Amino acid sequence: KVFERCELARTLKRLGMDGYRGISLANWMCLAKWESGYNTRATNYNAGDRSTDYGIFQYNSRYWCNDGKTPGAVNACHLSCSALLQDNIADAVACAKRVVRDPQGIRAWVAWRNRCQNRDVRQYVQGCGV
DSSP states (O other): BBBOOHHHHHHHHHTOOOTTBBHHHHHHHHHHHHHHHHHTTTEETTTTTTEEEETTTTTETTTTSSSSSSOOOTTTOOHHHHHHHHSSOOOHHHHHHHHHHHHGGGGGSSHHHHHHTTOOGGGGGGSOOO
16 A cells, blocks of 8 residues: 555554654654655565565564565564555554664664654654644
C-alpha cells in the first residue's frame, strides 16, 4: 500500500509513535518518506552484501527480520521479512520501536542523517490534525 501523507501520520500516532524514545512524529514521517515514499511493499536488494531492505522503513534482513537467504543474519524483531510487506503496518511499527531501543536510536537509518537531522521537519505533519 502507498499511504497518503496525513493518513500515515494519523496511523503512526494511533500506534504510539509520537515521542517514542524521544522521537517526534515528524521525524518518523521524514524517515518513511525518504526510505520508501510511504510504500509498504518496497524492497531493495543490496548486491554487495546479499541482504535486502523490506517495507515502509526499509528494515535490513541482516539484523531485523528473517528471509532465510541472508548470510550471518539475525532476526532482532523476531519476524519473517514477509510481515514487513503487509498493508497493515502494526508489525512494522513494533519493529521500528525495537530498532530505536538500541543506543543509536533514530540514527540507525543513514537516510535520517542525510535528509532529516537538523532540518525543519514540520512540513511532514502540517495540517494532518496530529
